[PDB]
């Protein structure tokens, strides 16, 4: 429950983030790299749990 609800909150904040960060495709933004890192970290924590 904890892990999946954290994942849900992170998905909602990603829905927030897409309003703020640029949609450029030339290169991965540093903030975008950090967001992907956080998402993969959550997913790995869920798998390990």
């Amino acid at each position: 429950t904890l892990s999946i609800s954290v994942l849900l909150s992170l998905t909602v904040f990603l829905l927030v983030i897409v309003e703020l960060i640029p949609s450029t495709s030339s290169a991965v933004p540093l903030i975008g790299k950090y967001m992907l890192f956080t998402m993969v970290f959550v997913i790995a924590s869920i798998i390990i749990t």
């Binding site: 949609s23 450029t24 495709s25 030339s26």
Partner: protein, 48 residues
């Protein structure tokens, strides 16, 4: 592209000729100054 006013028997289009004598039947690009778009790349641009 077309002439808004004149028909084919009044105005007739042809492609420009490069300084080397070759017809430029394509969209020209300043390869030394053009910058690709952040979302789309251009592969071909023929003209007819």
């Amino acid at each position: 592209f077309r002439s808004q006013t004149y028909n084919a028997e009044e105005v007739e289009f042809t492609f420009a000729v490069d300084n080397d004598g070759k017809t430029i039947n394509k969209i020209d690009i300043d390869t030394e100054a053009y910058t690709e778009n952040g979302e789309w790349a251009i592969d071909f641009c023929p003209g007819v």
